[PDB]
Scaffold this active site. Structure first.
Site, PDB file in Angstrom:
ATOM      1  N   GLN A  11     -27.010   0.124 -29.100  1.00 38.93           N
ATOM      2  CA  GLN A  11     -28.083  -0.298 -30.022  1.00 38.93           C
ATOM      3  C   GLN A  11     -29.479  -0.281 -29.399  1.00 38.93           C
ATOM      4  O   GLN A  11     -30.382   0.305 -29.981  1.00 38.93           O
ATOM      5  CB  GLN A  11     -27.806  -1.677 -30.646  1.00 38.93           C
ATOM      6  CG  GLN A  11     -28.772  -2.024 -31.782  1.00 38.93           C
ATOM      7  CD  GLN A  11     -28.120  -2.770 -32.939  1.00 38.93           C
ATOM      8  OE1 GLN A  11     -27.209  -2.252 -33.588  1.00 38.93           O
ATOM      9  NE2 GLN A  11     -28.592  -3.988 -33.209  1.00 38.93           N
ATOM     10  N   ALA A  12     -29.655  -0.926 -28.245  1.00 35.74           N
ATOM     11  CA  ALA A  12     -30.937  -0.983 -27.556  1.00 35.74           C
ATOM     12  C   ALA A  12     -31.458   0.421 -27.244  1.00 35.74           C
ATOM     13  O   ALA A  12     -32.578   0.770 -27.608  1.00 35.74           O
ATOM     14  CB  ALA A  12     -30.805  -1.789 -26.270  1.00 35.74           C
ATOM     15  N   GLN A  15     -32.249   2.362 -30.601  1.00 31.41           N
ATOM     16  CA  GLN A  15     -33.434   1.829 -31.250  1.00 31.41           C
ATOM     17  C   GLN A  15     -34.699   2.180 -30.458  1.00 31.41           C
ATOM     18  O   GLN A  15     -35.692   2.601 -31.061  1.00 31.41           O
ATOM     19  CB  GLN A  15     -33.304   0.319 -31.487  1.00 31.41           C
ATOM     20  CG  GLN A  15     -32.364  -0.021 -32.645  1.00 31.41           C
ATOM     21  CD  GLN A  15     -32.151  -1.518 -32.878  1.00 31.41           C
ATOM     22  OE1 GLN A  15     -31.549  -1.923 -33.878  1.00 31.41           O
ATOM     23  NE2 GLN A  15     -32.633  -2.343 -31.958  1.00 31.41           N
ATOM     24  N   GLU A  62     -19.936   2.358 -32.109  1.00 26.17           N
ATOM     25  CA  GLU A  62     -19.793   2.067 -33.545  1.00 26.17           C
ATOM     26  C   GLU A  62     -20.778   2.955 -34.306  1.00 26.17           C
ATOM     27  O   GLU A  62     -21.779   3.360 -33.749  1.00 26.17           O
ATOM     28  CB  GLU A  62     -20.008   0.581 -33.861  1.00 26.17           C
ATOM     29  CG  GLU A  62     -21.447   0.109 -34.048  1.00 26.17           C
ATOM     30  CD  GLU A  62     -21.524  -1.350 -34.484  1.00 26.17           C
ATOM     31  OE1 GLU A  62     -21.022  -1.668 -35.586  1.00 26.17           O
ATOM     32  OE2 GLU A  62     -22.096  -2.177 -33.736  1.00 26.17           O
ATOM     33  N   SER A 131     -28.909  -1.035 -22.203  1.00 22.53           N
ATOM     34  CA  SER A 131     -29.099  -2.424 -21.854  1.00 22.53           C
ATOM     35  C   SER A 131     -28.073  -2.822 -20.806  1.00 22.53           C
ATOM     36  O   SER A 131     -27.102  -2.119 -20.608  1.00 22.53           O
ATOM     37  CB  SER A 131     -28.961  -3.322 -23.090  1.00 22.53           C
ATOM     38  OG  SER A 131     -27.677  -3.209 -23.678  1.00 22.53           O
ATOM     39  N   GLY A 134     -24.814  -5.465 -23.188  1.00 19.09           N
ATOM     40  CA  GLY A 134     -23.801  -5.006 -24.132  1.00 19.09           C
ATOM     41  C   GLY A 134     -22.639  -4.347 -23.426  1.00 19.09           C
ATOM     42  O   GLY A 134     -22.778  -3.875 -22.309  1.00 19.09           O
ATOM     43  N   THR A 136     -21.223  -1.533 -24.296  1.00 20.10           N
ATOM     44  CA  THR A 136     -21.502  -0.100 -24.264  1.00 20.10           C
ATOM     45  C   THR A 136     -22.594   0.161 -23.235  1.00 20.10           C
ATOM     46  O   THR A 136     -22.403   0.949 -22.316  1.00 20.10           O
ATOM     47  CB  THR A 136     -21.981   0.365 -25.655  1.00 20.10           C
ATOM     48  OG1 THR A 136     -21.039  -0.057 -26.649  1.00 20.10           O
ATOM     49  CG2 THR A 136     -22.137   1.877 -25.718  1.00 20.10           C
ATOM     50  N   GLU A 245     -40.989  12.820  -7.838  1.00 18.18           N
ATOM     51  CA  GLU A 245     -41.987  12.203  -6.972  1.00 18.18           C
ATOM     52  C   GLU A 245     -41.836  10.703  -6.949  1.00 18.18           C
ATOM     53  O   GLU A 245     -41.963  10.127  -5.881  1.00 18.18           O
ATOM     54  CB  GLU A 245     -43.435  12.578  -7.342  1.00 18.18           C
ATOM     55  CG  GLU A 245     -44.026  13.730  -6.521  1.00 18.18           C
ATOM     56  CD  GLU A 245     -45.457  13.494  -6.048  1.00 18.18           C
ATOM     57  OE1 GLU A 245     -45.772  12.373  -5.593  1.00 18.18           O
ATOM     58  OE2 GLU A 245     -46.270  14.439  -6.098  1.00 18.18           O
TER      59      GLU A 245
HETATM   60  N1  LIG Z   1     -35.935  -4.267 -25.884  1.00 14.32           N
HETATM   61  C1  LIG Z   1     -34.965  -4.280 -26.831  1.00 14.32           C
HETATM   62  N2  LIG Z   1     -33.799  -4.910 -26.532  1.00 14.32           N
HETATM   63  C2  LIG Z   1     -32.776  -4.958 -27.416  1.00 14.32           C
HETATM   64  C3  LIG Z   1     -32.936  -4.311 -28.723  1.00 14.32           C
HETATM   65  N3  LIG Z   1     -31.777  -4.518 -29.369  1.00 14.32           N
HETATM   66  C4  LIG Z   1     -30.951  -5.233 -28.560  1.00 14.32           C
HETATM   67  N4  LIG Z   1     -31.574  -5.520 -27.411  1.00 14.32           N
HETATM   68  C5  LIG Z   1     -31.047  -6.225 -26.233  1.00 14.32           C
HETATM   69  O1  LIG Z   1     -29.808  -5.637 -25.820  1.00 14.32           O
HETATM   70  C6  LIG Z   1     -28.867  -6.645 -25.423  1.00 14.32           C
HETATM   71  C7  LIG Z   1     -27.658  -6.615 -26.355  1.00 14.32           C
HETATM   72  O2  LIG Z   1     -27.023  -5.336 -26.186  1.00 14.32           O
HETATM   73  P1  LIG Z   1     -26.811  -4.202 -27.325  1.00 14.32           P
HETATM   74  O3  LIG Z   1     -27.497  -2.900 -26.958  1.00 14.32           O
HETATM   75  O4  LIG Z   1     -27.107  -4.757 -28.700  1.00 14.32           O
HETATM   76  O5  LIG Z   1     -25.217  -4.038 -27.256  1.00 14.32           O
HETATM   77  P2  LIG Z   1     -24.479  -2.615 -27.257  1.00 14.32           P
HETATM   78  O6  LIG Z   1     -25.034  -1.678 -26.209  1.00 14.32           O
HETATM   79  O7  LIG Z   1     -24.595  -2.109 -28.676  1.00 14.32           O
HETATM   80  O8  LIG Z   1     -22.998  -2.971 -26.762  1.00 14.32           O
HETATM   81  P3  LIG Z   1     -21.824  -3.483 -27.730  1.00 14.32           P
HETATM   82  O9  LIG Z   1     -22.403  -3.871 -29.076  1.00 14.32           O
HETATM   83  O10 LIG Z   1     -21.233  -4.612 -26.927  1.00 14.32           O
HETATM   84  O11 LIG Z   1     -20.902  -2.293 -27.846  1.00 14.32           O
HETATM   85  C8  LIG Z   1     -29.657  -7.948 -25.512  1.00 14.32           C
HETATM   86  O12 LIG Z   1     -30.250  -8.233 -24.233  1.00 14.32           O
HETATM   87  C9  LIG Z   1     -30.719  -7.667 -26.554  1.00 14.32           C
HETATM   88  O13 LIG Z   1     -31.865  -8.512 -26.409  1.00 14.32           O
HETATM   89  C10 LIG Z   1     -34.232  -3.629 -28.979  1.00 14.32           C
HETATM   90  O14 LIG Z   1     -34.457  -3.046 -30.051  1.00 14.32           O
HETATM   91  N5  LIG Z   1     -35.165  -3.648 -28.013  1.00 14.32           N
HETATM   92  N1  LIG Z   2     -60.203  17.728  -3.237  1.00  8.04           N
HETATM   93  C1  LIG Z   2     -59.062  17.589  -3.946  1.00  8.04           C
HETATM   94  N2  LIG Z   2     -58.069  16.862  -3.380  1.00  8.04           N
HETATM   95  C2  LIG Z   2     -56.895  16.670  -4.021  1.00  8.04           C
HETATM   96  C3  LIG Z   2     -56.717  17.268  -5.348  1.00  8.04           C
HETATM   97  N3  LIG Z   2     -55.480  16.927  -5.739  1.00  8.04           N
HETATM   98  C4  LIG Z   2     -54.913  16.183  -4.751  1.00  8.04           C
HETATM   99  N4  LIG Z   2     -55.767  16.028  -3.728  1.00  8.04           N
HETATM  100  C5  LIG Z   2     -55.528  15.298  -2.461  1.00  8.04           C
HETATM  101  O1  LIG Z   2     -54.399  15.940  -1.887  1.00  8.04           O
HETATM  102  C6  LIG Z   2     -53.377  15.043  -1.458  1.00  8.04           C
HETATM  103  C7  LIG Z   2     -52.127  15.302  -2.294  1.00  8.04           C
HETATM  104  O2  LIG Z   2     -52.394  16.564  -2.888  1.00  8.04           O
HETATM  105  P1  LIG Z   2     -51.506  17.336  -3.963  1.00  8.04           P
HETATM  106  O3  LIG Z   2     -52.418  18.213  -4.773  1.00  8.04           O
HETATM  107  O4  LIG Z   2     -50.570  16.355  -4.631  1.00  8.04           O
HETATM  108  O5  LIG Z   2     -50.724  18.278  -2.929  1.00  8.04           O
HETATM  109  P2  LIG Z   2     -49.541  19.212  -3.441  1.00  8.04           P
HETATM  110  O6  LIG Z   2     -48.944  19.879  -2.227  1.00  8.04           O
HETATM  111  O7  LIG Z   2     -50.085  20.107  -4.516  1.00  8.04           O
HETATM  112  O8  LIG Z   2     -48.412  18.224  -3.999  1.00  8.04           O
HETATM  113  P3  LIG Z   2     -46.954  18.843  -4.241  1.00  8.04           P
HETATM  114  O9  LIG Z   2     -47.034  20.186  -5.126  1.00  8.04           O
HETATM  115  O10 LIG Z   2     -46.229  19.047  -2.822  1.00  8.04           O
HETATM  116  S1  LIG Z   2     -45.871  17.468  -5.106  1.00  8.04           S
HETATM  117  C8  LIG Z   2     -53.977  13.661  -1.612  1.00  8.04           C
HETATM  118  O11 LIG Z   2     -54.498  13.286  -0.330  1.00  8.04           O
HETATM  119  C9  LIG Z   2     -55.109  13.842  -2.631  1.00  8.04           C
HETATM  120  O12 LIG Z   2     -56.187  12.933  -2.367  1.00  8.04           O
HETATM  121  C10 LIG Z   2     -57.848  18.048  -5.907  1.00  8.04           C
HETATM  122  O13 LIG Z   2     -57.762  18.583  -7.030  1.00  8.04           O
HETATM  123  N5  LIG Z   2     -58.961  18.162  -5.168  1.00  8.04           N
HETATM  124 MG   LIG Z   3     -23.749  -2.568 -30.517  1.00  4.07          MG
END
Ligand SMILES: Nc1nc2c(ncn2[C@@H]2O[C@H](COP(=O)(O)OP(=O)(O)OP(=O)(O)O)[C@@H](O)[C@H]2O)c(=O)[nH]1
Ligand SMILES: Nc1nc2c(ncn2[C@@H]2O[C@H](COP(=O)(O)OP(=O)(O)OP(O)(O)=S)[C@@H](O)[C@H]2O)c(=O)[nH]1
Ligand SMILES: [Mg+2]
Ligand SMILES: Nc1nc2c(ncn2[C@@H]2O[C@H](COP(=O)(O)OP(=O)(O)OP(=O)(O)O)[C@@H](O)[C@H]2O)c(=O)[nH]1
Ligand SMILES: Nc1nc2c(ncn2[C@@H]2O[C@H](COP(=O)(O)OP(=O)(O)OP(O)(O)=S)[C@@H](O)[C@H]2O)c(=O)[nH]1
Ligand SMILES: [Mg+2]
Lengths: 432, 429, 432, 429
Positions: A11-12, A15, A62, A131, A134, A136, A245
């Site tokens: 459900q969680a 939804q 269900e 979740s 539950g 599930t 990353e």
């Molecule tokens: N954030 C969020 N939590 C939800 C939601 N609906 C249910 N919960 C949470 O999920 C938990 C209950 O589990 P569910 O997902 O309803 O149960 P299930 O996975 O369907 O498992 P069973 O019914 O036992 O087969 C509780 O912690 C609820 O507060 C939602 O829409 N949003």
């Molecule tokens: N001058 C300049 N510096 C950058 C830019 N993008 C990232 N950096 C610097 O580079 C470092 C990381 O760079 P990044 O661009 O993520 O490297 P990369 O090798 O491309 O990352 P990856 O593909 O391995 S996951 C950081 O120190 C950041 O400050 C840019 O567009 N210009």
């Molecule tokens: Mg359920």
């Protein structure tokens, strides 16, 4: 090229998925029927003549929740084979999810994933939504992860998991489910993004001025965070950070793979006009405990890694400035073995807003993924909860009746104890 | 006659590279399609150093674009000037390196390197008399760092008698741009010390300072930063590309600037950088240029030359000016700031002068300084590395790719030795 | 070749500077944009082509006064880098000027001076404009002078310093500021020209027939005197005097370096053409106490040295005649150790008049710099003022709060006592 | 450039504050929406002193509205200009203080203070260079007095180098507004003596007198009374906010007006004051203004300056006027009224002139007198305190909230010491 496969469990998960795919469509200009009058392609595959299909699987044990999707507004968006339902749910029982009921559909689910993956030319990996609580979300998900690890292995896997609250419980068996699923999934998951419903509710009430927030609102908010994570893949950016990353940056030890998510700014229509929103200002907002989406206190923990993903009208110099000042801040401590704490992403596209949404449209937003020793507290709490019930063997017979062995409970518990100790050890500062 | 091979690795490498190319084409009167629409025969005379002439009066960069990721490449292709490049000279992967040196050097990069090498060799063989290779990249990521080093290793092995120079964007003091940047830089440096002729240390922090403080840009963009770098790059080849009075090239500069093989890490500088309001009040003449060049605030490396000694300094001037005046200026700085220049290299200031000024200007000057202060940067990296490595933080990301702790250790050791060497010559009398 | 660098400190210094640079421009035919449709060169450097830039630095610790220059009529005349401002003013506190606030910009100011000085081939020295009473004019100026003494030394330094009036005043703590800055600057300055607002106001009212003189008028008057001092360098004259010469002539003992300035004729067009302004007539006007710009009586003191700078339609013989008669005059008594008391300068260029000014256009004028034992009175008054407040330690806590020590007050006071006695000693005639 | 933070505590504090804000808006050409619709560039030059610039040409007061009850806040929100404020900057409780200092300082106020502080800190960090804080509040109630003092204490602790000034509504001698006001004032004063840098004493008795006798208003309203206060406040910041000839600020005024740390209690005054009819029959010139300023009927504190001596007087003039004339006038008053000025502070008058006049007027003047006569008020308060405290009347209302007699006693003692000190300087020769 850089395809991303989304899996929505229970459900969680389903939804949330509804909210995410609604948002994606709006962002890429895809109508509810899959049509549009190139970037979309990482999330939507292309079929025949001007129709686009989500690279997704929705699974529930269900039919009720998925039936809504089938009969709903987005019925034409998904192909029927990507919406998978069983007959009987896991009834808040991990065992039923992992074994008794789950083993009947796992092959099917995986087969469909394989078909999805076969039409990908540059698979980046998987986004798994569920979740902890539950049957599930806990039991099925662990099973699913296991299978995924076998058939793919070295493809980045990400879990957005609704970690149970301290006060706001839902079921009684939540602690059991949480513990077992964490234990069984630990060695199979690369990175997991925890979220807490209590915290989001609080945010909605305080920051969005919403008297009575619905699950829908929470889901919508979550969709924003997710969008920010994948914007670097779905759009062009000046500095880009991808799914692989994140795991490299945020995981110092294999077990410590639980960063917390924070979004900023989340404001109302009235509060847009009376507040300026600079990069430093929103970053500070993010880094302050009241805006956090897990009910935990970072002031009582240490930061191990931060990833900051900015989007929209953002200037790199400004971000650098903002971060510099946050570094100085006494109330933000980082672990002593980590001089470099920030991975920074900056993308050109502003967060796009759903028509009739609760959030105001802003020129700049940011999504922080930060790993903190404060998570230890949550684990301690969960363990305590487990201990209280397990000492009496409360509910244990259910689990055993569904084919689980009692020894596995104790095993899960001890593994979690070990995890707790690992965090503690990491916490302490370097000698000499 | 004197062909250079240009290489761009990773996001940074490719974005800087594109800007550089744009600058160069503008200089030589080449438009986004590769056609010459210039005015002087001087613009075509030495076109061949950077461009190959194709059929139907078009010019194409002797440029290779490399990345493990396809997005930045695509962006480049879609940009203004994207269409000037040879389509077959884009070599891109699908996976990425996930900011991991191991992936860039041993895994993903390894599987792509041969394809790059094949193109590179072909390019080399096209050219009559190869001067060498320039590599533009960062040290902080996975491709620029790991893949880049691999490329350097192989190219050097193939062509040991051609010059290998790099424009390396080095990680900065204040901000940490990534978590594992110390690992990536440290590893890279180990290779560079063994396999490059000269390495231009560009630091983004310094660039920011320049843009904000000197250029008076409240809101600098990465493009602006890239432009500065490109200008500096252009400065170094100007004497190879145009007629001049006193003519330098890449080999001669290396010879003057490198007194010992390992000590080849330059802090580059550019003059004159000025604000829009501030331009008309100052007279851009040689003295002004000189004053601009020799100070901490205008250096593109995060280190104060006043914290060490200058081993050697090369100044390259562009425009119609008095050679005598230039020489006088050079003398003056040496004489008055005697304590900032190591005393066992007499007249440690080298000059080059090219008659062709950059566009829009009457003159400019480009600076290459080899200062013992750069050791501070290395020390910082060493310290940061150690802090992490002592607790084996993030180590499984690298060991998972086949790397061993010994490699890390050796790299650290080498870095330390280099620092010691730098110190020794700083202290020598 | 004989360049002069002008430094304008604080509100008074800046405002006076405005008036001076306005005048210089009119005198050399430089427009407000720096253009003109060789003599200028001692005050203006030349940049690019057809542009002339003042050899000047404007400094204040607050932005407001300098902001007027930036936004005003002569915005294009000055180079932006020569306009230096801090954030917070010195709040009529010497300590803030000399230490707490001044230490933030002193290095910057000096650096810019060095750049200015490096473009000079025959630097004569400096013109320093400030007040004694303000925290900037007192504290900053003293600091600046100290640095100048160290970094240049033998290059001359000249001060136009606004002495507080006896009866009229602006601040409460004016005496403190005046005393400290005089103490700290004394051994570092070569010559200081006192000018007093009360006296100039009186002149304006009596001689110019102005009911309500503004600070502007005072500034204009001051600018005349300054022009006369620099005319010998900016134009060709019959008998010439350059900034070094003044100090040699005007200062008989190192500590006694306070002359006073007097300009004449100061008249209106209503009362200019019912006179013919001969050299004798204007000289007599100058040497009478009513035309003086210090509220002090030379009739009660003795003259030590005068310098008379004539400008315009002047004949040397006539000047000699005029001086001869003044020598005889009973109301002019000179010290016994000075047989010849006048340096005379004569320049061909008439003082040109500012459009919309209060002064009438004349064929001739004179600026006297005269040194008198009568100044002792002012010092005595200031000391008395200091002692009244210091006996109660009134306001002292402010100064101490900014790092000044109580002992320094007493030190300043004793130094001034010594100065007072020095004047007295000088006063008496030689034995035998 | 010199940002000021505005704070409003309690009913009075908020009502005054709103009016002040309105006045400021008009001055700077700001409409009820926060948009600039003025004409002169001078209106926006220094707009940042009181306003933060929000996104899309809006300006919002750097204002904090604080109260333990929600009614006044609500009224403000619904009032003219209510929409200009940041909604998050209204920080209000639910309980109320019940005219009890204890509740404001230790109980209800304690529960609310952190929320205020959080906002305050944010506001401070918004500003590049914080000049300091102005607090508008009464001494006679519970929130403005108890909560306000607490706030002051915390702000001082946080930012001891930024100046804290307070516009304090003091209890009148003739008619007591509330029963426990002597206690509330006395306690407040204890805090104020140690924690504020300057304190403007306003009494409503004075204001009423001015409105009826000088302004010829048969039936003044509280709004009208508050307008006078607003005028004073705006007058006090005019030299910081606009160009002038001789430019005062908060620091300078403090230096001129406070010879000893504790003696920083001013009697503020304003000129001109004219009816609709009575304005045309007498010309507004400097000397007339000066005359208007220096008399008992025009002071906003109900104390006769003829019963004491002026230690220091600051006059701030707004409009185009001749400095010479002003100076002459200042001298004249000193000369002729020699006996009303302390003998050991020569030139006890401080003068400032700002060229921008207030709206509707050609010239005006704002007066700040530090008079030993204010001791009268303190003596009266002490007397009133004593009369109640010796019989322990109402004491259980305060002790019930955790307060003890000792605290009261010490407060009383401190107040008496201040009075003694005032007397000593009044009588010194
Ligand atoms: N954030 C969020 N939590 C939800 C939601 N609906 C249910 N919960 C949470 O999920 C938990 C209950 O589990 P569910 O997902 O309803 O149960 P299930 O996975 O369907 O498992 P069973 O019914 O036992 O087969 C509780 O912690 C609820 O507060 C939602 O829409 N949003
Ligand atoms: N001058 C300049 N510096 C950058 C830019 N993008 C990232 N950096 C610097 O580079 C470092 C990381 O760079 P990044 O661009 O993520 O490297 P990369 O090798 O491309 O990352 P990856 O593909 O391995 S996951 C950081 O120190 C950041 O400050 C840019 O567009 N210009
Ligand atoms: Mg359920
Ligand atoms: N003649 C003349 N005197 C001035 C002028 N402006 C200010 N003064 C005098 O200078 C003294 C006050 O010092 P200022 O220069 O205003 O103060 P400041 O240097 O700006 O120092 P702070 O404001 O305390 O930082 C008083 O005696 C004023 O009368 C002016 O334009 N002309
Ligand atoms: N000038 C002025 N004075 C006021 C106004 N309202 C109240 N006062 C004065 O303030 C004092 C009481 O103010 P009050 O508003 O009760 O303070 P408070 O702290 O809000 O009261 P409380 O919430 O603790 S019960 C009295 O001396 C009264 O004369 C006003 O609108 N203008
Ligand atoms: Mg000033």
């Amino acid at each position: 090229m850089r395809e991303c496969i989304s899996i929505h469990v229970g459900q969680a998960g389903v939804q949330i998925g509804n909210a995410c795919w609604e948002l994606y469509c709006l962002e890429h200009g895809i109508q509810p029927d899959g049509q549009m009058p190139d970037s979309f392609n990482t999330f939507f595959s292309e079929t025949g003549a001007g129709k686009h299909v989500p690279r997704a699987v929705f699974v529930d044990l269900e039919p009720t929740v998925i039936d809504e999707v089938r009969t709903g507004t987005y019925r034409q968006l998904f192909h029927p084979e990507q919406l998978i339902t069983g007959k009987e749910d896991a009834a808040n029982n991990y065992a039923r999810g992992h074994y008794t009921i789950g083993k009947e559909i796992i092959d099917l689910v995986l087969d469909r994933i394989r078909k999805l993956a076969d039409q990908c030319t540059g698979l980046q990996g998987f986004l798994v939504f569920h979740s902890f609580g539950g049957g599930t979300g806990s039991g099925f998900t662990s099973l699913l992860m296991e299978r995924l690890s076998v058939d793919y292995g070295k493809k980045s896997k990400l879990e957005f998991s609704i970690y149970p609250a301290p006060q706001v419980s839902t079921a009684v068996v939540e602690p059991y489910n949480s513990i077992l699923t964490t234990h069984t999934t630990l060695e199979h998951s690369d990175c997991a993004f925890m979220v807490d419903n209590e915290a989001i509710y609080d945010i909605c009430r305080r920051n969005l001025d919403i008297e009575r927030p619905t699950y829908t609102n929470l889901n919508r908010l979550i969709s924003q965070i997710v969008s920010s994570i994948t914007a670097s893949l779905r759009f062009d950016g000046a500095l880009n950070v991808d799914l692989t990353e994140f795991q490299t940056n945020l995981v110092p030890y294999p077990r410590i793979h639980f960063p917390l998510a924070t979004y900023a700014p989340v404001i109302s229509a009235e509060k847009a006009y009376h507040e300026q929103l600079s990069v430093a200002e929103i970053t500070n907002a993010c880094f302050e405990p009241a805006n956090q989406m897990v009910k935990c206190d970072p002031r009582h923990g240490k930061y191990m890694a931060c990833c900051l993903l900015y989007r929209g009208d953002v200037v790199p110099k400004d971000v650098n400035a903002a971060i510099a000042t946050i570094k100085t801040k006494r109330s933000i401590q980082f672990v002593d073995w980590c001089p470099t704490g920030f991975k920074v992403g900056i993308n050109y596209q502003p967060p796009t807003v759903v028509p009739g949404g609760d959030l105001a449209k802003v020129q700049r937003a940011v999504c922080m993924l930060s790993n903190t020793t404060a998570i230890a507290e949550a684990w301690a709490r969960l363990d305590h909860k487990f201990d209280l019930m397990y000492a009496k063997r409360a509910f244990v017979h259910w689990y055993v009746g569904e084919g689980m062995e009692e020894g596995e409970f104790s095993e899960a518990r001890e593994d979690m104890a070990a995890l707790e100790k690992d965090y503690e050890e990491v916490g302490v500062d370097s000698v000499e | 006659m004197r062909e250079i091979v240009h290489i761009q690795a990773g996001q940074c490498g490719n974005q800087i590279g594109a800007k550089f190319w744009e600058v160069i084409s503008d200089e030589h009167g080449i438009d986004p399609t590769g056609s010459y629409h210039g005015d002087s025969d001087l613009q075509l005379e030495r076109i061949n150093v950077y461009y190959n002439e194709a059929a139907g009066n078009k010019y194409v960069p002797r440029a290779i674009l490399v990345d493990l990721e396809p997005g930045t490449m695509d962006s480049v292709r879609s940009g203004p000037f994207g269409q000037i490049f040879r389509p077959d000279n884009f070599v891109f992967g699908q996976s990425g390196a996930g900011n991991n040196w191991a992936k860039g050097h041993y895994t993903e990069g390894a599987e792509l390197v041969d394809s790059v090498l094949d193109v590179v060799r072909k390019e080399s063989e096209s050219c009559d008399c190869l001067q060498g290779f320039q590599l533009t990249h960062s040290l902080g990521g996975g491709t620029g760092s790991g893949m880049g080093t691999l490329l350097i290793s192989k190219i050097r092995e193939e062509y040991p008698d051609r010059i290998m120079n790099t424009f390396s964007v080095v990680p900065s003091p204040k901000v940490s741009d990534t978590v594992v940047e110390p690992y990536n830089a440290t590893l890279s440096v180990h290779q560079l010390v063994e396999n490059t002729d000269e390495t231009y240390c560009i630091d983004n922090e310094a660039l920011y300072d320049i843009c904000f403080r000197t250029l008076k840009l409240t809101t600098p963009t990465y493009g602006d930063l890239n432009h500065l770098v490109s200008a500096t790059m252009s400065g170094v080849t100007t004497c190879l590309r145009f007629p001049g009075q006193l003519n330098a090239d890449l080999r001669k500069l290396a010879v003057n600037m490198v007194p010992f093989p390992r000590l080849h890490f330059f802090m580059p500088g550019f003059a004159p950088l000025t604000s829009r309001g501030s331009q008309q009040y100052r007279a851009l003449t040689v003295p002004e240029l000189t004053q601009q060049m020799f100070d901490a605030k205008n250096m593109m490396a995060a280190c104060d030359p006043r914290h060490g000694r200058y081993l050697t300094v090369a100044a390259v001037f562009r425009g119609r000016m008095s050679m005598k005046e230039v020489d006088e200026q050079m003398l003056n700085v040496q004489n008055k700031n005697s304590s900032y220049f190591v005393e066992w290299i007499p007249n440690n200031v080298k000059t080059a002068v090219c008659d062709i000024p950059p566009r829009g200007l009457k003159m400019s000057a480009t600076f290459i300084g080899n200062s013992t202060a750069i050791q501070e940067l290395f020390k910082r990296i060493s310290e940061q590395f150690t802090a992490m490595f002592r607790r084996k933080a993030f180590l499984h990301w690298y060991t998972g790719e086949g790397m061993d702790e010994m490699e890390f250790t050796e790299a650290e050791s080498n870095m330390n030795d280099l620092v010691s060497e730098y110190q020794q010559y700083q202290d020598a009398t």
